[PDB]
Structure 1
């Protein structure tokens, strides 16, 4: 039995800015392989870095001020007000620093997922805004790769029982071993699982959609291919 389907990325993530600024450098090769947590961009941190330190200086000051008054009020050398106001400022500073720190951190646009980044929709030197609609880039885990197969709800059961009645080659709980046949006609050398748990159902058709998972090193398989699973 041959089940028609489309290959899809195993995982998709969008790269976006979370701080305002100018793209200083784009540290990645379009179309290369990037790891999750890897810096993909550098937003000119000249200022954020400046504010952050400007802040810490402030906190260092107000903090001393406060700690000194805490001591003094205990001996009434100072009033309950002055200490209150002093500890007030101290708290505000401490807050500012934390916000400064957060923004500086967002200056290094990291990759959320491990996969394959394509073209960078943003040129170096460009202006980037937190909340902006468009994404700077898109990474894609392409190794284990999906193959979305759609069968009429009936067939999914039929297969499901053959799986339990040993009539199908086990591949794991709810998974049968399968082979892939490119629209090329050729036979993808490796083979993978065909999980039976449903992922979606077009109630307007009643048909179900399940996923096959093939190993894809060498990156021979790419999203969008019209293939055929085999049981």
Structure 2
């Protein structure tokens, strides 16, 4: 149904999900590193600024070593992964895997307006 995609560009770092298994209503699927967008911004915290609390130094508490996580939309099954750790991925350009719901009742069956 879906062809899932990352909220940023960079490169894959981890594979939380499994090719051919199931997914919860938004289980975490991938991790990315922001490659060279962060190249000017990484160095201060990588040396030392990570230890502080000031809003421009403290960024290791907000994004670690320049990572972003990716998650499913809804409950279902999930296809063969299209990517691995080191595949260069981009926000609509590379496509990570497909997500495919088991039945449609798990989002709008009768009362699911307080479940979805």
Instruction: Give RMSD over aligned pairs.
Output: 3.6
Query: Any gaps of 5 or more consecutive residues in structure 1?
Result: 1-11, 64-92, 146-212, 214-231
Deviations 1:34-86 (A, max 9, x none): 112211111137986x74x84888982xx7xxxxxxxxxxxxxxxxxxxxxxx
Q: Tell me the residue number matched to 2:8.
A: 19
Change (3 A) 1:115 1:57: same
Q: Tell me the residue number matched to 1:140.
A: 100
Larger radius of gyration: 1
CA distance in 2, matches of 1:124, 1:59: 32
In the TM superposition, structure 1's runs of 4+ consecutive aligned residues that sit over 2 Å from their partners are 44-48, 53-59
Structure with the largest fraction of strand: 1
Structure with the largest fraction of helix: 1
Count of matched residue pairs? 93
CA distance in 1, matches of 2:69, 2:87: 15
Q: TM-score, normalised by structure 2?
A: 0.59
Query: Any gaps of 5 or more consecutive residues in structure 2?
Result: 110-116
Task: Tell whether 2:108 aligns with 1:119.
Answer: no
Higher relative contact order, chain-length normalized (CA < 8 Å, sep 6+): 2
